[PDB]
RNA sequence: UAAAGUUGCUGCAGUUAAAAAGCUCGUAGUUGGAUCU
RNA sequence: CGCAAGACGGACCAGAGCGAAAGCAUUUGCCAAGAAUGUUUUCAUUAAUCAAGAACGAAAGUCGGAGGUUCGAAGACGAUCAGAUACCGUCGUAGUUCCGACCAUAAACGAUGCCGACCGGCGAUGCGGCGGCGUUAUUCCCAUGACCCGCCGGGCAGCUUCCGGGAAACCAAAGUCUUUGGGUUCCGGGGGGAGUAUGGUUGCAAAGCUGAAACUUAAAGGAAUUGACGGAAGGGCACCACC
């Protein structure tokens, strides 16, 4: 996987994780 | 080269460059030993004797072998002063 | 027998070069191993350090040749190292022996402390380098032996160095570079200007000049 | 070169160098006595003067400041000392 | 380059102490996290009760069944 | 193609260098002499060698060729190497000399010479090729 | 590994160079890096020169030329064969083709 | 020279030098040839000091004479300008000439037909005879060269400052080297002019030989 | 900026000796530089030198005999005791037959052999061999 | 623990192998030109 | 033929200049700044590097207010494809522009900290100064401007390198290194897990900074050498190729 796209996927994971955590 | 008993223990005494006073190595095949013929003061003919200048390969490569030989000849009266 | 091909070989065969140190003194290159066979003769002890098979990729497959690393030298101040690559091991060994004979250099021995007896160690600290392999030789006290890896130990024993300290850095696992760095450090011993060599050089006649009449009389 | 003498350099080779890079540094500037038709007194003017120098005996400017040496007006005789 | 001053002892000491934590063996042996994760707890041996026998398959380049026990 | 290989080329060169006396310009005579003075083991190769010998004879009848060193052309060339003029080309009554070389000769202790004519130096310092 | 000492561009002593557009693809390519061709071509092609000359109202008209500056990205300049790949040694030759 | 009156340069030598244009160098100056030039003209040409030229020629003659076997001196000229001069020098002096292409490995490849091991090496142009000069650094071979103002001095041990471009200057330089070598040896004296004139060494191009005959 | 003018002087001498030059110009001069050069010259390594007097800080032109392999400075100037001198010589000198460590002691600037003769330790200035 | 000059004070490395902060000011820290018998 | 809008500033434009970097190109005016050069001016160690702190910081992005030509994420269609909702084409929304407030990240690169010495050569080029034959322009008495040939200082570069160094590629620095110490800051320690989790901290948000471990692995990787391959180029060849 391209490193930029790996970072984008990780950032989307973090966005969902911070969405679920309040 | 000399032990405490005074005996010489070197295999041989290597030549030193006549310009840089650095040792010329046994495998320095770019080094030269030029003989410059000596000449009679009134006839200008070969005397059978000469003067030897040893120039290492490092000086030859950097191009100052000519100037070194010129200075060695000047400082010896083979080449006229000025 | 041996028909010399060079002027130096002709001078050596006709018994007018007294020692191998004259050629070293005048820095002449040796192109015939028979000169070394004539001067050092039976005192030379060679051994094969390594046989490295090297392959070249081709369309049909890999072309394999064998490189022989050979160290030679009488255990009295002369050492050489020769590397030859051939299609066969025996030919490579013969070529490497010839090359090691041709590469023999004089080794300068010195003293660690008091100058009693024959010189036993290196005259000073010398360093040899060959492709990231740095070999440092340090003068050692009498009776120390060679404190070194097996390859530098073999080269130093062949050079006649009784006892020495050694340091190595870099990929010494590549035997060729390790051996070449040791050889470089060993050959640097006579290139080092020590205060006992400050005495002004007194030039003698070159073998080519002193025996020019014999060379032209043929 | 490999044997160029630094203790006794040629005078042209020292005037060639930068004033600070010489064996002993020395300025490239000097002072001049400039005579004006409108006066008689002594007016010593720095060669690299940064000021507008005016002759007290007339309405005539002596020199004008410049990026380097001052520009002496036409009709004034200047003698350099030292 | 590194600092070479007569009064640089504190800087050299602190830099070495901070850079030692980038050594894998040093961090493993001094952080204490690998010690709590060690089943033996720093011991050379341990005694256990055999729960079952298991055969683990060898890694890919060679084929075998390694006779192990879960203790 | 009709490219002659090294065999016929080298054989022709040697035959011409060694027996330039007998060879001529005719193919038939060159064929006969080539058969006589050489052991050519094939007749096709003999004919090819004779043909290239004829071609090279035409070549050398019009000047010197580098592959062959016949004795007559070498003698002519060496005779040309010894040609010496009646008066030396350096024996000029007047030698034109620039002012700077005259000053050098003055510093050279040769300033009294009357062969030297001082020429006007070129007032243009335009001696370098324009850049671009 | 560094292929070129100048990094394939002609930028020394500055940070940013304004981009231009490749004449073929409209790629944004820096002006220093772009391959520039200055084409000075006759408006009338050499085949049509004689026919246009005869139909000319004015004798000795000397027809005008076309001045078009061409900017190329590396991809389009290589594909169009304006530049070619060269050996590691011949790459250093900056002399324009003698033509 | 050694400041001897016998070895001083005469008016005839200066006449020959000026007629051949030996004092005229090029527009470029090698930084190791600066000590041999005198000034730069208004047209950019560097003037070669003929005192230094005579000094270096006499030094080269001494070096050649010191070689006991004349055949051990090798004279080289790849350019046609110095070729005939090199053959004439070898004929008069006894040196071994190499006129034309210098085969690489001549000094280093012992298994080779044209293998020679000279004790001295003289070239017409260091820039044009760079191959023998490079090989002389493999066999401890000292080198004498005829060097212009822009000539490189690597591996050159005695550089004779002279115009090595013009045919007249090259021929005169080789002729004077041969004359001085012979005079230092003893054959031919310096009290009367040498019987061989300098034009025997000059290069003649095909146009010139056709015109003359 | 330029600190430790002795380091600059010794580096210039070393670089000029590597290049094979006969003279080196050192600037600025200093008392410690002159003392180090004098210690070098007493042992025959460097030969005569001349101090050019410009009215701010001298320059020195040093003749160079080809005898010098390396001259170096030790920074910082560690205080060396007579019992730690042997370790310094083993670290710095090529052998026990030649080579000198130059110390600065209350008895002056001298080599390690003299410092042991006078029974003084000091501060290490440099070395030369 | 040595080997490990793979923790480098002696004594490592930082263009491409891991690596010089995007850049510049800046306090503490570290270092600091000649010159006195 | 005009009119109106925003955007941009072609060619000139360069291995040219300026700026700390990001970056900077239509004219003119104003405002403050700056390097270098010149200096026989002044002060007289006032300096170098820098934890903590601080200013600036492409693009994209965020919040307000204008503007909204062109291009254009998203989106809507049309297209040879086995399959685009990809590449191509027609439109097109946020954006792209300006004014405030944030954001502080780039292959932010010379993948090369800064200050200071020494170490080859050559030809240019930008700026300042100095010297000099001659050629050109303002009434015929001179500077000066444009050329020409040089020297000095700083600068952007073009260099062998057997000075030297490197694993080499290559580098006059990436040299002056086992012959190892000029000063100082930051920073790496096999590959993954991972710039992840967590804590803290900044932010409206997007996210930024600091930043593990369990576990897993014998290699990953750098330079180069030969071959093989290329829907890579150049030049040739074959009716087991084609025409």
CATH number for H71 = 3.40.50.10490
Choices 2.20.25.100, 3.30.1490.20, 2.40.160.10, 3.40.50.150: CATH for D1-82: 2.20.25.100
Positions 38-57 of E with beta carbon below 7 A from strand K are: none
What is the set of domains in chain I, with CATH numbers? Answer: 1-68 (3.30.1370.30), 69-129 (3.30.1490.10)
- Give the containing element (helix H, strand E) for C83: strand C78-86
Nearest to B58 by CA among B24, B26, B27, B34: B24
Give Cα separations from I73 to C49, C175, C193, I39, I87 (angstroms): 42, 36, 21, 14, 17
- Cβ atoms of I116 and I103 within 8 Å: the answer is no
Between chain D and chain E, are at least 3 CB pairs below 8 A? no
B56 in reach of chain I (CB within 8 A): no
Round to whole Å and give the CA distance between F82 and F76. 10
Between chain B and chain I, are at least 3 CB pairs below 8 A? yes
Query: Which chain B positions have a beta carbon within 8 Å of H158's beta carbon?
Result: 66, 69
Give Cα separations from H72 to C27, F103, H118 (angstroms): 19, 41, 4
Mutation choice for D interface testing from I15, I21, I50 by most D CBs within 10 A: I21
Chain-centre distance for alpha carbon C211 = 27
Task: Inspect the interface and report whether the beta carbons of C28 and H140 lie closer than 8 Å.
Answer: yes
Burial grade of C91 (CB within 10 A; 0-12, 13-18, 19 or more): middle
Cis? peptide before H211, omega within 30° of 0? no
Query: Which chain D positions have a beta carbon within 8 Å of I59's beta carbon?
Result: 23
Q: Count CA atoms within 13 Å of residue H193 on its CB side.
A: 10
Question: Going by DSSP bridges, is the β-strand pair C133-139/C126-130 parallel, antiparallel, or unpaired?
Answer: antiparallel
I56: CB partners within 8 A, 6+ apart: none
CB atoms within 10 A of CB F17: 13
Round to whole Å and give the CA distance between E57 and E66. 6
Round to whole Å and give the CA distance between C10 and H177. 32
- Give the containing element (helix H, strand E) for E27: helix E24-31
C167 in reach of chain I (CB within 8 A): no
Provide the shortest C-alpha distance from residue C172 to chain H (in Å).
Answer: 31
Round to whole Å and give the CA distance between A10 and A18. 12
Helix (H, G, I), strand (E, B) or coil at D65: coil
- Cβ atoms of B10 and B26 within 8 Å: the answer is no
Nearest to H178 by CA among H97, H74, H79, H91: H91
Å between F132 CA and K108 C1'?
37
H14 in reach of chain B (CB within 8 A): no
Nearest to H117 by CA among I115, G40, B29: B29
Provide the shortest C-alpha distance from residue B31 to chain C (in Å).
Answer: 7
Residue-wise DSSP of chain B: -B-TT--B--S----B-TTT-PBPPTT-TT-EEEEEEEE-TTT--EEEEEEEEEE-HHHHHHTTHHHHHHHHHHTTTSSPP-
Helix (H, G, I), strand (E, B) or coil at I113: helix
State the angle between helix axes of H167-185 and H50-66 in degrees (0 to 180), rounded to the nearest 10: 50
- Cβ atoms of C121 and C145 within 8 Å: the answer is no
Round to whole Å and give the CA distance between H140 and C59. 45
I2 touches strand K (CB under 7 A): yes
Mutation choice for F interface testing from H41, H54, H83 by most F CBs within 10 A: H41
Q: Count CA atoms within 13 Å of residue I78 on its CB side.
A: 14
- Cβ atoms of C201 and C71 within 8 Å: the answer is no
I68 touches strand K (CB under 7 A): no
- Cβ atoms of F61 and F34 within 8 Å: the answer is no
Round to whole Å and give the CA distance between G84 and G69. 20
- Give the containing element (helix H, strand E) for H40: strand H37-40
Q: Number of structural domains, chain H? A: 1
Measured between its terminal Cα atoms, the distance across chain C in Å is 19
Helical residues (DSSP H) of F6-124, grouped into ranges: 6-18, 27-37, 43-60, 71-81, 99-107
Cis? peptide before I76, omega within 30° of 0? yes
Round to whole Å and give the CA distance between C56 and D71. 77
Chain-centre distance for alpha carbon G5 = 22
What is the set of domains in chain B, with CATH numbers? Answer: 1-82 (3.30.1230.20)
**CB under 7 Å from any atom of strand J: which residues?**
C 169; E 1-8, 10-12, 16, 19-20, 22-23, 26; G 1-2; I 1-5, 28-32, 56-58, 76, 91
CA angle E26, E30, E34 (to 5 degrees): 95
CB atoms within 10 A of CB D61: 15
Round to whole Å and give the CA distance between H119 and H141. 6
Round to whole Å and give the CA distance between I13 and I69. 10
Can you give the length of chain E in residues?
71
State the angle between helix axes of F6-18 and F27-37 in degrees (0 to 180), rounded to the nearest 10: 90
Nearest to H145 by CA among B73, H154, H13, H178: H154
Looking at chain B, the residues that come just before a C–N gap of over 2.5 A are none
H24: DSSP letter = B
Give Cα separations from B37 to C84, C151, H51, I101 (angstroms): 44, 50, 20, 46
For chain F, positions 73-112, list CB contacts with chain H under 8 A. 80-85, 88-92, 95, 97-98, 100-101, 103-105, 107-108, 110
Between chain A and chain H, are at least 3 CB pairs below 8 A? no
- Give the containing element (helix H, strand E) for F96: strand F95-97
Q: Token digits for F13?
A: 């060169």
- Give the containing element (helix H, strand E) for I73: strand I71-73
Q: Token digits for C22?
A: 């004259």
Round to whole Å and give the CA distance between G72 and G47. 28
D51 touches strand K (CB under 7 A): no
What is the set of domains in chain C, with CATH numbers? Answer: 1-106 (3.30.160.20), 107-200 (3.30.230.10)
H137: CB partners within 8 A, 6+ apart: B29, B30, B57, B60, B61, H155
Residue bearing tokens 């066999």: H139
- Give the containing element (helix H, strand E) for E55: strand E52-57
- Give the containing element (helix H, strand E) for C94: helix C89-102
How much helix, strand and coil, in percent to the nearest 5, is found in chain E?
40, 15, 45
Experimental method: cryo-EM
Round to whole Å and give the CA distance between H173 and H57. 8
- Cβ atoms of C178 and C140 within 8 Å: the answer is no
Helix (H, G, I), strand (E, B) or coil at H47: strand
Round to whole Å and give the CA distance between A21 and I125. 66
Sheet with I59-63: list strands edge to edge: I23-26, I59-63, I49-52
* Range F105-108 contact pairs with CB under 8 angstroms and sequence separation of 24 or more: F105/H14, F105/H50, F107/H38, F108/H14, F108/H49, F108/H50, F108/H51
Round to whole Å and give the CA distance between E25 and E22. 9
Provide the shortest C-alpha distance from residue I41 to chain B (in Å).
Answer: 17
Give Cα separations from E63 to E58, E59, E60, E70 (angstroms): 6, 7, 7, 21
H10: DSSP letter = P
- Cβ atoms of C33 and C159 within 8 Å: the answer is no
What is the set of domains in chain G, with CATH numbers? Answer: 1-99 (3.30.1740.20)
Resolution (angstroms) equals: 2.7
């Amino acid at each position: 996987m391209r490193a930029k796209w790996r970072k984008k996927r990780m950032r989307r994971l973090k966005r969902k994780r911070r969405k679920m955590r309040q | 080269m000399q032990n405490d008993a005074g005996e010489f223990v070197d295999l041989y005494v290597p030549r030193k460059c006549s310009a840089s006073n650095r040792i010329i190595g046994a495998k320095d095949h770019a080094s030269i030993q030029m003989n410059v013929a000596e000449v009679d003061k009134v006839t200008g003919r070969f005397n059978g004797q000469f003067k030897t200048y040893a120039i290492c390969g490092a000086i030859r490569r950097m191009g100052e072998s000519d100037d070194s030989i010129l200075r060695l000849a000047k400082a010896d009266g083979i080449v006229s002063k000025n | 027998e041996w028909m010399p091909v060079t002027k130096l070989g002709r001078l050596v065969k006709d018994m007018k070069i007294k020692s191998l140190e004259e050629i070293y003194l005048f820095s002449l290159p040796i192109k015939e191993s028979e000169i070394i066979d004539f001067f050092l003769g039976a005192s030379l002890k060679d051994e094969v350090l390594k046989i490295m098979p090297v392959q070249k990729q081709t369309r049909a497959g890999q072309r394999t040749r064998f490189k022989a690393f050979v160290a030679i030298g009488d255990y009295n101040g002369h050492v050489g190292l020769g590397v030859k690559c051939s299609k066969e091991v025996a030919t490579a060994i013969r070529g490497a022996i010839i090359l090691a004979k041709l590469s023999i250099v004089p080794v300068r021995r010195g003293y660690w402390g008091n100058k009693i007896g024959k010189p036993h160690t290196v005259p000073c600290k010398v360093t040899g380098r060959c492709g990231s392999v740095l070999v440092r030789l340090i003068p050692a006290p009498r009776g120390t032996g060679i404190v070194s890896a097996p390859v530098p130990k073999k080269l130093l024993m062949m050079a006649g160095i009784d006892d020495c300290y050694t340091s190595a850095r870099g990929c010494t696992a590549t035997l060729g570079n390790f051996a070449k760095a040791t050889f470089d450090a060993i050959s640097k011993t006579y290139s080092y200007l020590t205060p006992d060599l400050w005495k002004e050089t007194v030039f003698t006649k070159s073998p080519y000049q002193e025996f020019t009449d014999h060379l032209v009389k043929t | 070169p490999l044997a160029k003498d630094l203790l006794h350099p040629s005078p042209e080779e020292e005037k060639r160098k930068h004033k600070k890079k010489r064996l002993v540094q020395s300025p490239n500037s000097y002072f001049m006595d400039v005579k004006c038709p409108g006066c008689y007194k002594i007016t010593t003017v720095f060669s690299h003067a940064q000021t507008v120098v005016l002759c007290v005996g007339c309405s005539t400017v002596l020199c004008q400041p410049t990026g380097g040496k001052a520009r002496l007006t036409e009709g004034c005789s200047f003698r350099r000392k030292q | 380059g590194k600092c070479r001053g007569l009064r640089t002892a504190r800087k050299l000491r602190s830099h070495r102490r901070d850079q030692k934590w980038h050594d894998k063996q040093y961090k493993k042996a001094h952080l204490g996290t690998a010690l709590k994760a060690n089943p033996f707890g720093g011991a050379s041996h341990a005694k256990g009760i055999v729960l079952e026998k298991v055969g683990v398959e060898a890694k890919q380049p060679n084929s075998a069944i390694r006779k192990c026990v879960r203790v | 193609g009709r490219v002659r290989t090294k065999t016929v080329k080298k054989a022709a060169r040697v035959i011409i260098e060694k027996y330039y006396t007998r060879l001529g310009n005719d193919f038939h005579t060159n064929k006969r002499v080539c058969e006589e003075i050489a052991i050519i083991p094939s007749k096709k190769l003999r004919n090819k060698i004779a043909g290239y010998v004829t071609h090279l004879m035409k070549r050398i009848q019009r000047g010197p060729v580098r592959g062959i060193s016949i004795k007559l052309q070498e003698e002519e060339r060496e005779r040309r190497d010894n040609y010496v003029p009646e008066v030396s080309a350096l024996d000029q009554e007047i030698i034109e000399v620039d002012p700077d070389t005259k000053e050098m000769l003055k510093l050279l202790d040769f300033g009294s010479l009357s062969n030297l004519q001082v020429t006007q130096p070129t007032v243009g310092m335009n001696f370098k090729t324009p850049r671009g | 590994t560094k292929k070129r000492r100048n990094n394939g561009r002609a930028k020394k002593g500055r940070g940013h160079v304004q981009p231009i557009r490749c004449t073929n693809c409209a790629r944004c390519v820096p002006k220093d890096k772009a391959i520039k061709k200055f084409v000075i071509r006759n408006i009338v092609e050499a085949a049509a020169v004689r026919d246009i000359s005869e139909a000319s109202v004015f004798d000795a008209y000397v027809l005008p030329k076309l001045y078009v500056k061409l900017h190329y990205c590396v991809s389009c300049v290589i594909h169009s064969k304006v530049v070619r790949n060269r050996s590691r040694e011949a790459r250093k030759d900056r002399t324009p083709p003698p033509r | 020279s050694g400041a001897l009156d016998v070895l001083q340069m005469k008016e005839e030598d200066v006449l020959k030098f000026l007629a051949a244009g030996t004092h005229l160098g090029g527009t470029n100056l090698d930084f190791q040839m600066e000590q041999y030039i005198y000034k730069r003209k208004s047209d950019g040409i560097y003037i070669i000091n003929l005192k230094r030229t005579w000094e270096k020629l006499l030094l080269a003659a001494r070096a050649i004479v010191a070689i006991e076997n004349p055949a051990d001196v090798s004279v080289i000229s790849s350019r046609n300008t110095g070729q005939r001069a090199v053959l004439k020098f070898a004929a008069a002096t006894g040196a071994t000439p190499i006129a034309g292409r210098f085969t690489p490995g001549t000094f280093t490849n012992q298994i080779q037909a044209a293998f020679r091991e000279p004790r001295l090496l003289v070239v017409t142009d260091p820039r044009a005879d760079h191959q023998p000069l490079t090989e002389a650094s493999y066999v401890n071979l000292p080198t004498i060269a005829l060097c212009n103002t822009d000539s490189p001095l690597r591996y050159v041990d005695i550089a004779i400052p002279c115009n090595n471009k013009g045919a007249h200057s090259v021929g005169l330089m080789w002729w004077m080297l041969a004359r001085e070598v012979l005079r230092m040896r003893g054959t031919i004296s310096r009290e009367h002019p040498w019987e061989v004139m300098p034009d025997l060494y000059f290069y003649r191009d095909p146009e010139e030989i056709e015109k003359e005959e | 900026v330029r600190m430790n003018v002795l380091a600059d002087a010794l580096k210039s001498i070393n670089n000029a000796e590597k290049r094979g030059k006969r003279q080196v110009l050192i600037r600025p001069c200093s008392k410690v530089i002159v003392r180090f050069l004098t210690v070098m010259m007493k042992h025959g390594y460097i030969g005569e030198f001349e101090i050019i007097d410009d009215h701010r800080a001298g320059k020195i032109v040093v003749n160079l005999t080809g005898r010098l392999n390396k001259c170096g400075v030790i920074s910082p100037r560690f205080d060396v005791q007579l019992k730690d001198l042997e370790k310094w010589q083993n670290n710095l000198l090529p052998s026990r037959q030649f080579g000198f460590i130059v110390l600065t002691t209350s008895a002056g600037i001298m080599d390690h052999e003299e410092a042991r003769r006078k029974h003084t330790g000091g501060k290490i200035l440099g070395f030369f061999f």
